[PDB]
Symmetry: C5
Subunit: 311 residues, 5 copies
């Protein structure tokens, strides 16, 4: 078919609305997420307008093939929106009330720097390409934008589903395009962080620190090195729960610092033994005594430094 | 086509029924499950009613394109229900007897807190959007709701397939919707839990506890630390069988407690050695003697505490 | 179209036949397998019968849209059978000779208790729902049921492809259904079991047993505990080749027993050391001497016990 | 439509040709590979023959629905060939020149016994089922069989794409079938086998062998056993690069032999220590001295034995 | 339909243009990448020409079935381009302005030799097969070739999207083909390399080097061998971030060199101990003293050698 003719030099406003039925399958690595939702569209086609008295009925139900429907697409999707039309209703003035139920895999970038205290702002971009006969602009219908209460993304809290009312109108490949931003705000909700990442790593670190209450080089080497392997093993056990990223995480920084503390530990152990063997057990025990407090304090300061450096 | 005209101001009741042919592919991580089933629908369209004497036949077989069929959908599905119609039969009064065989990936949330003694209640939500001409309500036909005996979900026991007879009628995007809850109750059936998780972890823990029958710091460090690595390695070996969750499991708590017992073990070993070296082998052996009973008893109490705290 | 009218009160027998072109992608975890095969169907539709003299041709080739074809489905499949029709041939009496080439993912349960000496019996269930005009029953055409010689399922031996000639006729959702069982028997063929699972595990176990020819608690702890880690690491290396199951395997039981032998080993090592330190090296060496034979013999007996207990 | 009538009692030869556009996604585990290619077919349908003078044009372009095209399929494929027709050209004599661009997942068995020096011969089997009106035979058009120069299968060298000119004609399910073999020869080309598998494994093995230049049982146990774990760790690090197979590899055999050398090493270490403790340090050092040469030589011989036994 | 007839002996130029909407899912292993983009095509079909005065409209919107559209395909794709047409606009002269939104998985080869400082040049090959009536050639429309600013490929910097203006015209399977190269240049952006690969590996290596400040063979064996395991465990922890390749990487070479330094370390430790036991602690400490500087210096030189050898 053909688009509705203009009022006068003025473009066609299409009233959009997305209602989140089910939000799921968030891929922290791939920066994707799947959504099953309703897309409500509304425009005024005066060609379809009818007198309610002569026709007998107030709202006429139509098939998509019969009526002209604007070509709405999503900007940040992987493939076809896999949509099925729910209901088309034309009011006597010609205002079409479109509704479809779609399921799409959305590519929204993710920021794990503050992991696992980070919050993500998910984007759904709605696009419409203006044809040469008439120009098309998008709008937001606030009553038709929401989310179901039962929407669950395990490990996160679904804060708000909102949209940027003002569209981003720009020129692309010699034609006008109207873009709309649908923002899904989610905060992180890891409660087992401390009991299944930090706490057992802190134990493996403290165990190594008992070498400051020992003089046996053979036992100290065994402590610091064996606990280091224990730590790696543990880092492999939690490897899945950790985010694979080209940038440095907050948790990623803690982990690095642990590896630095194992090195500094070995330095001490090595020094304590070298001073003892080089007949100066005066300094050798002075250092080992300080290291009993120097290691915990410097660790707490360095952790306070990063926690401030990230937050 | 168009929906059947009403009796008088009263809505159209659609008699639903789901019969489970095959239930499979449960993703404990993604909280999904796949089901192959029959969907039986029944409504009264008086337009299709016919006299059995004049026509000659009692029940007329129809194609989906020919007849009006209500737009039934599933709320918690990943995509299109991938359905194929089995048989449409209209009785002389106009009662349509619909039947389809569908296969859908259902998103039902899972609760692993009581893992692996937890039970899950799986949801299948049936929805129908009322159009403006007439309002549609859903109902349950108890003879047409069941499950095949051969339905297997390995590692679980399929208890019951039932449905909430009373539908949840609510207003969404300016129109009425009727929702139906289909509940699939499954209990867990892990029998190799103890022989392939608890028992070998308890061995790795008891081995470490032999350091209470030893005075050699070099052998004690080797015992407690090497068994700790053994434990981590084992936790990596059972990592697959364990549930990845943002919350704390019952099994997840046991595991944590093990890591705490390794720490307390090291503390003892460290103390025993420090009192010996600081020329007081009176206290050093008093503690090591108590720790022979203090560790098993405190472990059994702390396990009784959690088992009560979860169940 | 409509089904062929009956002979007299008697149902329509549909002669089935499956010929395995390619059998592949067996998922030991998911209990699935993929198959590419021919499905041959044959029924007598007298409406299509023709005189060979008047028509000129003996067998008429038809399109699926033209002729009535029974609604045959598979019971235990994941989705649509993804079938394409090869050839439809009607003989002068009206006997239709249907043939299609399909590819389906079949859900057949698996039993790994006797792993890796277990044999599996794979099921393909053929179903046909009887409509109200006439009742439909299934039959097997023995010449049209076979398998290609080149059919390979790596790691297994394809024994036989057969079918239960007598169908399972039952009442479902107020209508008759005819079910047919197609059985694919496969035995296991793991030849590197012993060289890449048992043999290196038995070495890691024997190495630990050298602590019965040693008196050094420091070396004995190092032996038994370090070999225990070696064993876990090895169990992680073979973790992939091992079956993930909620029940206890034969190999799974051997593995458990190994972990129990490490514990009993430690008990001995601990006892030998405690008697030595407690000034009784008479008993301490008596036990270590017996353990040299007590451990191998009790291991061989306990393995003979399980091998009998499973087979 | 219907097939072309025969010349006289003689069958229809269909001239085939496959040209490899892109070859990719080889699954060493699943024994699959994906290919994007051109399929050129040519047969003589005299019904379509035309006079070039009267018609005006030399070659008539047709749609697949219009013309009869033989039902060509692939034997060893996973699903539908996902083909799109490029061009159909009929010459004045009636010789049809078919061309399609398909993408299929081919199941060709693989032989990793000589891994990673093994070569694979990939199969693409073309099939055509003869109908009752006329019998169909396949042929190869040597000018229409090739491969693109840019065809890359990383980690392999694409040697040759050829085909067995003589087809395999046989009887299946009461009808004739013509089969054609398309062979893709690829040799293995992993170059850092030695730097990333053999060389570091040989280091972990040599390190263990320093226990022949040592008398300390505590250090020898630590060497042989700790290096054994190091070896397992390393075998887990290269686990991905290794082929999962039910049969024994060449590399798989080397690996086994390493595990046997660790056992024999421990035996020596255990014996050396037992003779020393049993007051005979004459034999105890004689063995340790021989083992300095006995282990390298027996290793080189045993490796020469396997390298000969496989190649 | 049929292609537009020629001007005179001259081919039809099709003006192409690809605009990158979303670039994502890069598989470093499979050498694939997914792209969602606009494909703009323009050719002159004079058959479609029309008078704007008589028709009333300046540009006629058409359906793909109505008009002839050139058969454009991609050379290096996995399957069907999964395209949906956006807008077809014919000007009064007959110049068609085609536009589609496609999503395809592109196979472009990758070069990880300089990983993680490597740059990749991604290829998108456009192809059009000339039919016998008229020859088809491709061209590039520079205003219709670009990329969206929001295009993100995490861990890489999207430098430029350009195209080789001159097409590659060649003869294939007896007909002319026009090929166009679309180049996507990306450099790597790993910032967590040093903190999560090199730095912790360098710590595990330096720790081992403390054995040059020690004389205890028991502690030296424990250091060098236990740190070696630590290193393997760490190499398994970073195994994911490392590229699986048949060739040698820059990072892969560093890793190899580390394994060689562990071997040379053991040689030293073994030599130091053998000279001590063979009553020459003069040389034994001379070597251990030099190795304190010989190991760091030779490591820095060997790293400078490779960094120069790759860059």
């Amino acid at each position: 078919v053909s688009p509705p003719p203009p009022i006068a030099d003025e473009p066609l406003t299409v009233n959009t609305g997305i209602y989140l039925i089910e939000c799921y399958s968030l891929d922290d690595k791939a920066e994707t997420f799947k959504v099953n939702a309703f897309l409500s569209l509304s425009w005024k086609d005066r060609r379809l307008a009818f007198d309610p008295v002569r026709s007998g009925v107030r709202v006429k139900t139509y098939e998509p093939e019969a009526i002209w429907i604007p070509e709405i697409r999503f900007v940040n999707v992987e493939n076809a929106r896999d949509a099925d039309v729910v209901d088309i209703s034309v009011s006597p003035d010609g205002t079409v009330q479109y509704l479809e139920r779609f399921s799409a895999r959305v590519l929204s970038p993710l920021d794990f720097r503050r992991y696992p205290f980070d919050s993500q702002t998910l984007h759904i971009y709605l696009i419409v390409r203006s044809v040469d006969t008439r120009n098309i602009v998008l709008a937001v219908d606030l009553e038709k934008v929401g989310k179901n209460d039962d929407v669950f993304l395990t490990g996160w809290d679904i804060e708000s589903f909102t949209a940027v009312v003002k569209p981003a109108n720009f020129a692309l490949e010699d034609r006008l395009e109207s873009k709309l931003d649908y923002q899904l705000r989610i905060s992180r909700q890891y409660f087992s962080y401390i009991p299944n990442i930090i706490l057992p790593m802190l134990f493996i670190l403290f165990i190594s620190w008992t070498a400051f209450w020992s003089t046996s080089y053979e036992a100290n080497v065994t402590l610091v090195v064996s606990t280091l392997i224990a730590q790696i093993a543990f880092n492999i056990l939690v490897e899945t729960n950790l985010p694979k990223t080209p940038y440095m995480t907050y948790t990623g920084a803690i982990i690095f610092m642990i590896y630095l503390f194992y090195f500094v530990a070995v330095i001490e152990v090595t020094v304590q033994h070298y001073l003892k063997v080089e007949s100066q057990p005066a300094r050798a025990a002075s250092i080992t005594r300080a290291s009993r407090i120097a290691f915990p304090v410097v660790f707490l300061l360095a952790n306070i430094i990063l926690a401030f450096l990230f937050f």
